[PDB]
Design a protein around this ligand. Structure first.
Ligand SMILES: Oc1ccc2c(c1)OCO2
Length: 126
């Protein structure tokens, strides 16, 4: 069902949170080789999450689940903010700009946390 597909999408999201937190520790410790690998892994996870989310929104639309569509439109917009900040973080890493990396890292944490009440709201609406 779309609800089990959203639970699968939620788990992939949690996997990104887990990897993100081990990447943050690695960054703080200066282990740039680990950071590079974690950033690649996070890219894959975010790409996968985004794909699952679009499939869930499209299905909600085909099902005429207006409330779910509203919430998913808001959530996917927030997800794109996160993606843009993530890509800026990756660029800051490439450039060796640790001050920008620190900034972007904090911002991505705030975007992800704020989206969680909505994320929980979607689970109930599908
Ligand atoms: O990759 C993400 C970017 C922004 C988010 C998110 C995941 O869940 C809540 O908001």
């Amino acid at each position: 069902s779309v609800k089990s597909e959203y639970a699968e999408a939620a788990a992939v999201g949690q996997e990104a949170v887990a990897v993100f937190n081990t990447m943050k520790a690695a960054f703080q410790n200066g282990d740039k080789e680990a950071v590079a690998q974690y950033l690649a892994r996070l890219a894959s996870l975010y790409t996968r999450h985004e794909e699952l989310l679009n499939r869930i929104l499209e299905k909600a639309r085909r099902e005429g689940n207006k409330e779910a569509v509203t919430l998913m439109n808001e959530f996917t917009a927030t997800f794109q903010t996160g993606k843009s900040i993530f890509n800026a973080m990756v660029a800051a890493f490439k450039n060796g700009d640790d001050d920008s990396f620190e900034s972007y890292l904090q911002a991505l944490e705030k975007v992800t946390a704020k989206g969680e009440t909505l994320a929980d709201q979607i689970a109930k609406a599908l």
